Symmetry: D2
Subunit: 49 residues, 4 copies
């Protein structure tokens, strides 16, 4: 009965779920990268001083 | 037949879906607020200069 | 001669430079905090 | 007397101050871009 309208909708919602999580995860990585670069620049300024 | 295991799972997945969206939306607001404050400070520095 | 043009302009540039450093670190703290909230929300969704 | 201690230290503080301003704006551009990508991803999910 995996082909029922309900089981098909479950798999569609699980795919949407996964896409939302990937969106959150990709932006978590972007936040970490920008913070890493921001703190590396603060250190480069201190070193040059 | 709204009480079937499948229909119950659909409503659970829709609630999860909504929670993921709220997580994305709340952080969109946080990003906007921090950028607004960041640009307002750059202007306050320019004005004081 | 601390009232020299030299020593006076030094003091103004030092004040501006201190304000720029404070601006950089205050924004650091603000981004760190929204990243903390973001990460902890993801951790909460993940075990729910 | 541009080689005065006054005028020399002025120039160093001006260079540092310019670097701090560039740092602030470069990070502005970087955050604006990740916010752009984030917002456009949400818009894409919303019409999908």
């Amino acid at each position: 009965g995996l082909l029922s309208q309900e089981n098909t909708q479950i798999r569609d919602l699980q795919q949407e779920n996964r896409e939302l999580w990937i969106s959150l995860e990709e932006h978590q990585d972007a936040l970490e990268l920008i913070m890493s670069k921001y703190r590396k620049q603060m250190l480069q300024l201190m070193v040059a001083k």
